[PDB]
Design a binder for this molecule. Sequence first.
Ligand SMILES: Nc1ncnc2c1ncn2[C@@H]1O[C@H](COP(=O)(O)OP(=O)(O)O)[C@@H](O)[C@H]1O
Ligand SMILES: Nc1ncnc2c1ncn2[C@@H]1O[C@H](COP(=O)(O)OP(=O)(O)O)[C@@H](O)[C@H]1O
Ligand SMILES: Nc1ncnc2c1ncn2[C@@H]1O[C@H](COP(=O)(O)OP(=O)(O)O)[C@@H](O)[C@H]1O
Ligand SMILES: [Mg+2]
Ligand SMILES: [Mg+2]
Lengths: 527, 526, 49, 537
Amino acid sequence: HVPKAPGFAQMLKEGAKHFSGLEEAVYRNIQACKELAQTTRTAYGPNGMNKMVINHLEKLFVTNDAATILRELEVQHPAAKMIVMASHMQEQEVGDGTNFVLVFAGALLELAEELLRIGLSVSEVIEGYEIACRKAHEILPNLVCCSAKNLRDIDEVSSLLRTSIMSKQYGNEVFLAKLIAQACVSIFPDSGHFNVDNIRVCKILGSGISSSSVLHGMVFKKETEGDVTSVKDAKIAVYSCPFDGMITETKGTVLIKTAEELMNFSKGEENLMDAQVKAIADTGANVVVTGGKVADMALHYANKYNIMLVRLNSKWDLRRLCKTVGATALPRLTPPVLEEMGHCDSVYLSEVGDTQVVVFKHEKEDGAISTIVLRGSTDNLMDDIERAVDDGVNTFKVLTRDKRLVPGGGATEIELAKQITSYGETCPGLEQYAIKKFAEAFEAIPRALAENSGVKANEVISKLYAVHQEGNKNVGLDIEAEVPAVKDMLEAGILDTYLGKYWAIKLATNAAVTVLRVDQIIMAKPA
Amino acid sequence: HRPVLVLSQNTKRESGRKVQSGNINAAKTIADIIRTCLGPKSMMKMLLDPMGGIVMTNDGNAILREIQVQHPAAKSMIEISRTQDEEVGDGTTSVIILAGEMLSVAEHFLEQQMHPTVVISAYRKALDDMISTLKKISIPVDISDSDMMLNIINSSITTKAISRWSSLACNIALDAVKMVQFEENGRKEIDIKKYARVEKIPGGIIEDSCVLRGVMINKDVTHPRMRRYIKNPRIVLLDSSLEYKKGESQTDIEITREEDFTRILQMEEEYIQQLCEDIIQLKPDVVITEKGISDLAQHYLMRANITAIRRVRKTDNNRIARACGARIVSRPEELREDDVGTGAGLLEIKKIGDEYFTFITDCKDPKACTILLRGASKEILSEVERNLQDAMQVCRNVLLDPQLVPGGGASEMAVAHALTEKSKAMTGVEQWPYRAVAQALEVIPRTLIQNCGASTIRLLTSLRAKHTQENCETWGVNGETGTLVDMKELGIWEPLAVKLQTYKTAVETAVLLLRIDDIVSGHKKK
Amino acid sequence: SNKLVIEEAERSIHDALCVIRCLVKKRALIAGGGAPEIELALRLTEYSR
Amino acid sequence: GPLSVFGDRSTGETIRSQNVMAAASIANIVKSSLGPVGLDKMLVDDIGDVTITNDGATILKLLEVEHPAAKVLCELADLQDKEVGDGTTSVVIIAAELLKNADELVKQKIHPTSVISGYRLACKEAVRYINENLIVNTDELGRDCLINAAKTSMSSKIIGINGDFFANMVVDAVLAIKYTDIRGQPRYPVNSVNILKAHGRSQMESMLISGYALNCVVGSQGMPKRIVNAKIACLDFSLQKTKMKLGVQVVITDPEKLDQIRQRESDITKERIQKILATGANVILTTGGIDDMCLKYFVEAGAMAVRRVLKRDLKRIAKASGATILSTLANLEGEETFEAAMLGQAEEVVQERICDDELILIKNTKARTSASIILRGANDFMCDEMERSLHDALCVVKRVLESKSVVPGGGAVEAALSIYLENYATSMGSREQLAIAEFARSLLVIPNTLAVNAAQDSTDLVAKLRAFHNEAQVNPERKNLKWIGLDLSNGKPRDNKQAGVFEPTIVKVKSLKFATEAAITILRIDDLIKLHPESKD
Ligand SMILES: Nc1ncnc2c1ncn2[C@@H]1O[C@H](COP(=O)(O)OP(=O)(O)O)[C@@H](O)[C@H]1O
Ligand SMILES: Nc1ncnc2c1ncn2[C@@H]1O[C@H](COP(=O)(O)OP(=O)(O)O)[C@@H](O)[C@H]1O
Ligand SMILES: Nc1ncnc2c1ncn2[C@@H]1O[C@H](COP(=O)(O)OP(=O)(O)O)[C@@H](O)[C@H]1O
Ligand SMILES: [Mg+2]
Ligand SMILES: [Mg+2]
């Protein structure tokens, strides 16, 4: 009766699919990456919306940063993973602009579909995108108007860090800018390498964001097991061995042969531990922090000679304490410490937010390390501010590597859209269509800023080209109210991450080119 | 087991951007199926039927009717090609590509936070300007000329599979419409479906196919003594039976005497001989009816030298009534001289492949003809039958509207420059969707070069520059070679009713599918 | 306006015609709104003593 | 202990919160299909049928519901078609918002009988205010009132073009079927307009057939399909062979009398067909059946015979052409008289081409000059939408010509009632003033839905809308701001008097009376008992 079509030449798979051509492979990779660009388009900008994303571990992640959203979404399309790993490389390089990659490369592949269906194949759209990408790296040093050079203190960086804060925390742009100014400048290495790992976030559940502060030191979440919690001298002896004595390594066996060696063994072990605790009490130590466990005999002489004990079960937190108070973790049992002692100002305990913490607070010598103690009503809010805190530390490392800045908020992408269109009209070849489409991908980036603010993007994008008549080069977007009448970005102070714009254009161009190189897809059976 | 307190059980709800941008992708999917079936360099598409048959064709209407889709917006595009198939002949594949392209540019404006009523109000203003452009570039046709009408039907079958036998299929389709063009009262009508029957017989060659001057049926004579070759027969068409049947009552006869049962059996024979004596008063030669003929009626027509056909269909009786000029009567005692089919030519009972066929041909002025198709098998004869239906309807549109539009890409580019020059005086938010209608018409010259393998960049830049001047305005795309030849030299001309129905249906398909922002599925009915 | 309001209006009219039906059988009426239930509660309490 | 019913019982504020979510489940569907910026929907069945519509009655009738509070709002939309005919998305949104604001009152420990009595004081005052603040009747505007009221109904549908093509065909259709009645009643029966559908050319080729458009074929292909100066013979009896009844049987005792009875079944049949055809009748319409023997007498005499027509179509032809619907023989023991002076008249009966079908047209009918509209669309989904949009447009001009009173549309009525009822609640309001104050906020959802579907400013355009209506009531300086509506294509308050946005009076009077009465019945479901389904026992 009804016939059917069998295999033809190479149907040898056991349950796997195959894609070949432009319509089955190239056009389907574009439409799959277009859905990720339309997903994070709402969360882009200062007026972006959050997204409650639940992973496979059945926990809640609510954020507006596009980097942490893609880590929880279990994407299975292969070409869609290329735009995720390109956004993950933006977080590892500069730490800001991960969403800029999804909008630009999502518009590069979308406008490439209009070129393959009207004209040139992938051999000329790729070569056309590479010419406009090299010309885009020549306009970005010409768009630099300000620099983070004069008065590197807490006053100038309080305004230069507001752009990375207001894109994810719009209402808290003033409080979080001052908290990131008293923490990043205080750990300055005196013209050296700025380490972003020297800033920790201690999430304390409690009151709102107005009670958050930055403490010069470290705040832990453990106990003391003692009664010497009030320490004012703060001479800290840091150890990595377990503070319970010196045991052997191979087997361990007490060998008793007479009645005198049995009775004197218990009293001789207590006198041996008594001589080791009093050896560090005569050196002036007050805080003894160990990594391993602590026996009951070590706690007996710790309270007798009035020294405080701190238990640190994490081995990574012990190395950060050595850079906090300026000490060295000794692997052997307690010696007379010559010069590797710690020196803090005040080590105390306080129950803040129904959580007994241990604070190594520096008062006079303020700059050795910083810890931003964040407060919040929910645990999900403190994770979102911590992402905004880490975007402020990563922006400070960008200004250490390169002090140049470009005016953001839509002012950079319009001038990049005007100069590439000028190079496209002066190219007497067939690849000038991809150069004109490369400049229109920069046009869609302030389009996402106006659609998230409830403003019509047609009237917004028309006023940007009207005020960019060859000499302004700075007017961006005013998203404070409807009927914008947009203003200057240097007067408002919206400029951030010139090095972030240098890498996000390069990574999104290489991501969109790599998708267009894929002509034949051979997948396996998922298991 | 307690029931769940729900509302609108077992149905779906979907709104927002997933329905506006979801119906565009369903329209782009159908337009990519028949995209390789528009130019003259097209290829056939073999289809498989649930009955077990095979439809190997390249016509855009016959492909989409064999596709069962589940998407609701995909079901709308199939009914568009069914509308274009019934209005005109060769207006199928062009509307589905054009409606997919007008929705392709409509998806761009839906992402710009523009309301769909603004794009439709710009589509209706653009639709009213495409009708006025085709009426300015048209040309009056001399319908009395034979060589002028052959160039119109050859332009419609160059895409189809009968372009190889173009010298034969043009003469068949032209003579088929000119025979069935009947006008009794003050109203001209052309019925090429009820009177122009296209019968196909497996065997022979395609070059021996010709339109008969008359009708033909697959029916043998009722008796071998009847003549199978009459020079000039007088055909009488009947509708009732020549038998003895039960009346529409509760008739019952009480038989008490001995002579009563033999009398009723004799009155059944005298009733058949009475109606057989009433049909021989006009001296006929051929008696054709729709119901059965008893053997008592075959005996009286045998010695009267009357050839009788038994079970001719009702649609075949209406077709032979126009060819021979007879009247289909339903009462043998009410026959008149006007009900006799005089003027009929040669009648011959031929045999084509171990089966008899009744031929009634060589008529004086027949108003209904039958196209005799003979080919290799029934597979390719269904292709020629579907192509001649697209060849006779494009001749019907010229005889009712003698205006020609320069096809082959010259029709779409002459309006796309007219919409571009008229868009300069818009000065509003509807100016940019007005420009996209002129860019959506570019997909018809895009398809003619993508099927032959030509370049779409070097050709469309030169073709758009040819319509910048108002003098030439008729330069199209030559699908045979791949260069730009003027359509006044090639001879590719499409009728006005084909191009007007193509533009009116492709816009209103985009009007319907853009106002859909919600889809409810999962409910039942009666 | 709905098919459910007419079924309630049919029962409410029959509850109104039955009130005047009781006045034909017994031409006597009392105060309503919890009036005779209090008097049946106080007089039967004194009757129980 | 508890109730021993075998079903389910839910009391308290559980059902009081479920009925509001049942009404909001229906209102949130039809909120996207209100006003000129409204958009149509898709109704896909399980068998595969697709219905594209935006009318509030066609959607809720095909949609299956289960909740008892949901069937009240679905049957509320069915009543709007018979009473008014276009008022059948706006009633469902008002009646659901009447329950949403009354749910906020009963959560404040306000008794629902005060909300029911408070809604009746606001509903009767809304009809009182709309009948004293109308602009003018149908004497000043003339024909401009009928065209502008027709374009307001078409703006929410597929026939909302910028021109006046579909608007002029509706006004010329209702004005051609003016049927007078006793005591001075110029009735306009809009059901007599035969609305036909055919997948053909664009919407600009919709013919306005002055007369009637019969949806049938000729039958036998030997009859003249065009008859000029035709005489229509409307009759309802099957023109088949004479079949005897059940009580009559043919019992013959003589074999010679057999063939005379058999020929008598066709002789009595053809005796009727010769006396109805010798009187000059050329067109014969039959609701019964004409068999193949009787079709010969029309081909021989040159007459048209149409078989198996509808009974509702025969009454519209015989009343418009002056024909008499005859079922049998009559006129005082007459054998065959037929009353030949009572034949119909027609200028031309012509079967045209309707894109591969047959359609019979009657031109002007010589007696009443009726009208029929043949619609032309792209596919069958547009033709079902064009039929529903045209039928709602015929009901608008029917109520304007009958009740010569129009109100400004586009939220101008709901803006004036939102401020007059707030001042009405302050004068005579002691305990039911909170229900009258929430009656005004529930009426504001009609201009609120016009701002959502247009993607315009919501809390600023309606705030600017009621700013003009407040100055028209508290500042008596003849400001004439009672006709301030919404311009959804621009996003600013406009004057609906000069813009031509007109709606009938009873499209809002009957809407406010049906939505208030439906909100009372759903407000009294404080206790609900649901029994188990008795199917398999
Ligand atoms: N005050 C402001 N005014 C206008 N635009 C702003 C303002 N602050 C931030 N933006 C815009 O918001 C966007 C936020 O981008 P973001 O999501 O941080 O990129 P990435 O994901 O690469 O970090 C920037 O492109 C910037 O132009
Ligand atoms: N020789 C030719 N040169 C250029 N174009 C041609 C030639 N022959 C046919 N065409 C084009 O091919 C198209 C075929 O359209 P077709 O699919 O037949 O429409 P429909 O489906 O309505 O019949 C026509 O629009 C015509 O312009
Ligand atoms: N030109 C216009 N300007 C402003 N509002 C309009 C315009 N045309 C129609 N409307 C509004 O659109 C609404 C459509 O209501 P509709 O859904 O037709 O009600 P129903 O379902 O009862 O027919 C009307 O209430 C009217 O106020
Ligand atoms: Mg940022
Ligand atoms: Mg063709």
